[PDB]
Amino acid sequence: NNPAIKRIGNHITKSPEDKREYRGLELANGIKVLLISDPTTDKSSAALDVHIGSLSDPPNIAGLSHFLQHMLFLGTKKYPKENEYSQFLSEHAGSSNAFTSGEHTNYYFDVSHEHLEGALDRFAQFFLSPLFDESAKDREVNAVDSEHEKNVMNDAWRLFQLEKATGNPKHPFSKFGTGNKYTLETRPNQEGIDVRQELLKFHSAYYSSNLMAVVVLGRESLDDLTNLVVKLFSEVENKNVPLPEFPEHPFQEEHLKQLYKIVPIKDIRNLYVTFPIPDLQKYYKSNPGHYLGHLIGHEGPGSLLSELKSKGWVNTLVGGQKEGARGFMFFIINVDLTEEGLLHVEDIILHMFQYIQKLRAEGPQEWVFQELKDLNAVAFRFKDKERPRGYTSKIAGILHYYPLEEVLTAEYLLEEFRPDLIEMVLDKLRPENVRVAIVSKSFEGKTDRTEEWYGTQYKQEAIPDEVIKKWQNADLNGKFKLPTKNEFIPTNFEILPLEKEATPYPALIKDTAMSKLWFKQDDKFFLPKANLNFEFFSPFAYVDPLHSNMAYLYLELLKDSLNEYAYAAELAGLSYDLQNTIYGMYLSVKGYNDKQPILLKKIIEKMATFEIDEKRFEIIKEAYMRSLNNFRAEQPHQHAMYYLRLLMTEVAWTKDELKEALDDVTLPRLKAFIPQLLSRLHIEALLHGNITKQAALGIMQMVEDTLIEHAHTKPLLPSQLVRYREVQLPDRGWFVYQQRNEVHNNSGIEIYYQTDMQSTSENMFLELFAQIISEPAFNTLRTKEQLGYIVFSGPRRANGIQGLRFIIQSEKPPHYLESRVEAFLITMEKSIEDMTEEAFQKHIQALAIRRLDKPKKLSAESAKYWGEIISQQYNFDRDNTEVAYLKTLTKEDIIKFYKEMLAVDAPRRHKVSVHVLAREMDSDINLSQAPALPQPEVIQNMTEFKRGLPLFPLVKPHI
Amino acid sequence: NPAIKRIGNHITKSPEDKREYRGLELANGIKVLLISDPTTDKSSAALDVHIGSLSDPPNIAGLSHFLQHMLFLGTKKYPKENEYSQFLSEHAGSSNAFTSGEHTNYYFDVSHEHLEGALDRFAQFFLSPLFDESAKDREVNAVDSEHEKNVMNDAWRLFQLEKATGNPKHPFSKFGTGNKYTLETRPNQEGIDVRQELLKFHSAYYSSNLMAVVVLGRESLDDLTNLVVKLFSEVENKNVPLPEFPEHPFQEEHLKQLYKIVPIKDIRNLYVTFPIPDLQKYYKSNPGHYLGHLIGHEGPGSLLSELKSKGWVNTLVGGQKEGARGFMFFIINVDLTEEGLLHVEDIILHMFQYIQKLRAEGPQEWVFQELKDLNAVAFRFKDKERPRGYTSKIAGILHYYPLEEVLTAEYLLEEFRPDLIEMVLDKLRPENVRVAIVSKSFEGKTDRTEEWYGTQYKQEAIPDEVIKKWQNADLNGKFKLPTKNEFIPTNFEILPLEKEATPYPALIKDTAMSKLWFKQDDKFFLPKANLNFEFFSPFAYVDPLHSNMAYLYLELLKDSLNEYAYAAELAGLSYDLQNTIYGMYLSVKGYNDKQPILLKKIIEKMATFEIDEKRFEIIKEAYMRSLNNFRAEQPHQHAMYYLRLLMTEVAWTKDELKEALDDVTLPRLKAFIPQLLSRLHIEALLHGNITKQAALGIMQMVEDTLIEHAHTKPLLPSQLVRYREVQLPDRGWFVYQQRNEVHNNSGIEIYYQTDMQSTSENMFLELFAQIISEPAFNTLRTKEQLGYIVFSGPRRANGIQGLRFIIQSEKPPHYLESRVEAFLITMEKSIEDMTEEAFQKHIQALAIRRLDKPKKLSAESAKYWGEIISQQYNFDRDNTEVAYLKTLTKEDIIKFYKEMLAVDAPRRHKVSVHVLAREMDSLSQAPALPQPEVIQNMTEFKRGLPLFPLVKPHIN
Ligand SMILES: COC(=O)NC[C@@H](Cc1cnc2ccccc2c1)c1ccc(OCCCCCc2ccc(NC(=O)[C@H](C3CCCCC3)N3CCC[C@H](N)C3=O)cc2)cc1
Ligand SMILES: COC(=O)NC[C@@H](Cc1cnc2ccccc2c1)c1ccc(OCCCCCc2ccc(NC(=O)[C@H](C3CCCCC3)N3CCC[C@H](N)C3=O)cc2)cc1
Ligand SMILES: [Zn+2]
């Protein structure tokens, strides 16, 4: 009926549990579209994906597709204002982003459901009439340069690019996609290159509709969205641009049978094994790479990892298919290395080849495939509802590779068993086709080459033919066996009827000296899943640095020992997490409820009757020592946040204290620790999901009985159940703690204005001021003043106390940052004074909607409940109570609050700043007038600082 | 001049004693000792009448005690009753008195400038006392108060019960305290005028010939002679023959008798007594001291060692017990285990076996010689005594020894008399034994009740078969005589005062492992040193279990080291070792000579200690009963104990500790000790006859002994955390209520928390406490008659302070609250009205008290140790704080009360603890009080309030 529509796709295959409605169609200009109708959604979204990226970049400008990614969303003929799209989405509780890959430039946003047409109209105009405003040319270069400079000191980005540089330089795969100040400014200036004209050349030659895909999600019907997208996207130019393909592999003979020795930033030992393979995409209905990745990357009994671990060579492994570009892919086998693993690289690889050879001897297995196909079927069926912004962005890219009807089922379903394709792929995984890379600090001052884009230090060798022959002739290994029938595969998906005694919030169904049990039966999602949360309290887990180290190692060793068993459950959508806390231990079991008690039983049984293997203990003790030293390689803002937590909490063991006390951790001392730690405990739990009241009680009893029987567990005294207090800062006080980051040449800062103890009134005073200043903070400090890559503002909540926080990572000294934040606070006071009641009520309403936002998955609901339980505040109806009080708030109340608590001259001001210096550092112009800042009290000793100040009380519970 | 009957020869003193002495007998028969000490801060005098309670008329019990109370209540020269106490209060003085069975000792101290003034008031009570009728009823309520206090005390209960089981016609059977019944109720019923009987007794017994006067002053011996003659030569001589009681109060019918007594506390004791002749005459030889030393010995081969080894007894006390002139006793008292209580006959057999070993081996001259040598050293290097107690003690012993031997008397032994040792030993036989067993296992199984205390007991005759068994006691090979004591000091060298010596302790070491404070003694010059150590460990108080483990570890350590340590303790080298809320405390005191040997053994034992399973179980049981036994402590103590739990950050209760005790196993304790000693911090004070280098060597030795045997590493500074005081809110009032199940008396503690300690805050509080001190006693105790215990003063804990009131009364706690509140108003008025002259008198009185210089090393060390344990280190505090006190005004104090303590103060921080009586249900105008916040749960109360900072240390 409509000439603007080429074809309306048939039924879009979806999960029976999916209530969202789908319509697929192709427009006359060649745009592939998917319309998502969700009358339930709080946020409406859209995405456009151009099948052009950084592999198409011109030789003259490296990072041009990525620079276009920035320059395209700056002004349009309909909306000449550069920041229109950004402002509209900010004004209507939205957000936007984009990314550039080698073959795609994806653009996306979300907005309040009532404003889809307005946001989409602004979005569509960039694909119709862009202007590329010459005024933002230099700031975008700096935004792209800031992105790369952040990546430069990242080990993964370094490796990613070093791999690209060690392939065929004549191949597009070797291109540097990010760009920088050099590639976008310095170099084009020297060569008399017109950056804007080269950008427009690129835009006009590649950005065509035939290579585009659109996804629109909203409350509006399928037909209303069909009209909206036709109106907005049938006018987009169709220059019939051919799809860029790369059939030739960037890895030719001279790039095979090669060995690379790389120097990292962090003290990490890793082995990377790669095989170039053809492009397997077209075989998505059988997916041979997934079959082989499942087996090679298996962690159960008889796996390659198991043997490599037993040999004491590796702890972790990753195996499978890795995307390349249209025409090529890679097969990887990635492992970490123990000190002995680094010495037995050749041996490890021999074992890798022995496992690959076992699969050849055994041949493909239909039963392994049946499990994989059946599991993905259950996965797709009971899958959680997606965040619309990520959902659209994802589908936009997927539309290019699959028929309209298969874009939901694409990466989930398996149909045909193709053992011939498995045999085809497995045949490329051979020693004459291997590329080997070792990453070790031991290569420092022993390297001859440099990757210039990042500065990575490496050496390259050709692998001796005698090493290749040993891998080819590799003898059989009986330790390697194919996995067994996965008994963890779920079968019972019955949604237990909603009980007569069912409550809207978690109810305390057990209250004893040993345990406090909070339970809720899911009354919203109705998926066969549940979340089991346990917090085990012991004063012996943080009494001193030694015991803290021992509580860490205990649980690392426990997860390691349970790994081979737990893996099968993980594959069957049942996962667990076990971490030590500053009060004891945390256990979470998520996923399908069916086989959930079995894994829980095993976890607690292992906990209570743990037999430590000396070899594992020594390997894990070494890796934890490295992990301690590796904190220095973390970013300055991350360090700043770590120092404030130390400073502000009553008891807190530093990384320096923990590593000093690690040497004293012996195997008998640890063997003595476990019964002592488990001798006396309090357990506080939350069991939420597809469970009944009597089932939750039986779970808790099983947990109790296992600890009582095997560990001889007894409860703790209520006087022993004590939490740490926050430091109480003095009125009109300002303290500064300074430290240096030795890895990065940027500064870090956290500015904390401590207000008072949390309450309905105090929370909403702070949250309203935070709501008001939120967007301006980013546009001022980040966009206008260009302070740093990281600019953050919001409430800080710790130990029942709260306040206002500012986190910034800049190239400018922390003391300059101090004066800028202070000027901004004055501007915000002016803004609140000057703003209208209409603009003020919009803030109260924006915050109110965010706080009343319904959780969209069970885990999101449980996380809200868990927060109230771990804070011991138990205010499950918080949002309603606090939103009712917020609506009564006046402009003058926030002005008074600022005047008394936050202002430079406020009578009750409590400012504490943490300054993290850059690697090389030492300690008008139409900008806001910064006030006069007093002399800070410089903190020299964390203990003396705490000893000289009072500590706050602890917040009283609701229940 | 002729008023002196004779002047004694040289008064034998120590060459180390710089004080001058003069003895003389007055014409009226008064024996006198004069002490000339120009350096003395306080001067003192004491008069002792050799007549006591054993002289009371049978129809008026406690009359001698009553005369003591009525004597110092006005005279002809000084008619007002308040005169004497008032005079001493105005001139930095004090006074007290005690009545025993044979003596009435009256004594005082005053400023060294006001000796003549004070002694003149004192002297009149021995010339023309008035005995004011106004105080008759108040003094009876005072004597009745003292007896009612002792009524629930197990030691006073036994003391009287023993006296109720002998010859009733013997003066020893007398109740010497008296009460409202014996001094008021019964005499009125019998038509006895107590006043005339009081005057009768005083006339008959208060004779100068039975009196001894001791005077200590800055004044010369010649000037002291003139003063004591001027005042005491007029005391009338009634020529009273000194009473004697040579019959033994236990005649044949009272021998071979078994007594079964019910206690208040869950205690188990065995008392074995032998009536003996009055050995006082043999004081130069002293055979009772000899046998006491051997029978009571705690070293290898001793009676105790075997009784411990068998698992029957933990402790033993042996030797002569004083009776009166004419009779004495020889005792062997032990405590019992659950098993000792079932093996009493076996314990006494073992006692008799040991006695027989002393017979078979005969007397040892070297044993006597060692005692002689030890008393010579102990007399020579005797610490300087506070004048008040020094005069009091001499006034008593003046009666017993010649003038010249009054100081050496209780010390020096001369001739070895094996004949006497055989004579005394011949009395230690089963035919002459008396046995008493104290145990709750007798509750409901007794027939008699002691009338004065209500003590429940049974009397039995020891069977002839049991006596015969004990008589036939074999020789036991387990008993061996003690060996030569290798702890006897020989090196008495006083090291020269170093060029770099300091007046206060100096920080001579500040490492991660230890903080060492040192001071060479520049005051006393006796061959002694005090070695104090604080060991910090987060594992000594992490939970109630570790706390019990810390207690038991040191108790077992002290137990195991006892046989070795006793020899040192006899040789004047004692030690203390106890668990703290932060770790452990060790103190080594006495003669420096053998001091590092003992300290090396204690530190070695700490680390290489091996636990005996039998002792562990025994000590564990002893500690479980000790926790329970707290229920029998006074209600005011209970009230003090609860406020320490309420106001401290972390504090494990007696209930939590006793609940944790069953989890203390032997493998658990063995795992704990290596763990506790693994990481330590030591804070020490080494004060005495030592050099800087000697101190450093001592600290290094302690550190190295721990490093070697325990692999000790230092803690992190971040781990050296001290508990905080709960910060009370402004205008707040919290009440905590409990009950005392044992006592029918109420206990209370009222705390007005002020602020953190600082020069200004300390002196505000201390000056306010000075002003209200006597009035609090006079109003609430004397006038209102609230109770025996009425206390007011500053409270100091965790760098914080405030005002406190402690009252033990039979009246309910809420009443005391309003009466204390009424008193606060009364003082608010009293301060506004008092003169500048009256105000300055309070400043001077506090200044004098605060500047009162220590008389011995121990007292100086204690002052320094207090500065160390608080982590304030303000050694020059007393000078600084007094200088500031002298700048304070009546206005400054008025401001402080109105802001912090007044019923309507803006910053009033009140917390009260109420401990009700056993039976209890759950005048100036008192102000209106708000409704208090009742503390249900101690932890929730603590969680709901903030915590104070910790006081900043005073740096050099
Ligand atoms: C993309 O960036 C790079 O190219 N980086 C370069 C190399 C490092 C390198 C290499 N060679 C060089 C040669 C010369 C010079 C320098 C060199 C540098 C690199 C770095 C990191 C890196 O990260 C890994 C993720 C890569 C994503 C693909 C993938 C996903 C999942 C799985 N597999 C799994 O998650 C599997 C499942 C697969 C599907 C079936 C079920 C199993 N499973 C699950 C969890 C763990 C388990 N053991 C396992 O196995 C495999 C691939 C990849 C490559
Ligand atoms: C004062 O109160 C009473 O009398 N109460 C009565 C009885 C309990 C009783 C008894 N029998 C009864 C019969 C029938 C009915 C009721 C009865 C009740 C009692 C209670 C407590 C009591 O307390 C004990 C002290 C009593 C002082 C005499 C003394 C001092 C020191 C030493 N001996 C030592 O200090 C010796 C040294 C002596 C000198 C040379 C060196 C050794 N040494 C040192 C310390 C420890 C060591 N094991 C030791 O041995 C001996 C006696 C005394 C008596
Ligand atoms: Zn970018």
Ligand SMILES: [Zn+2]
């Ligand atoms: Zn009295």
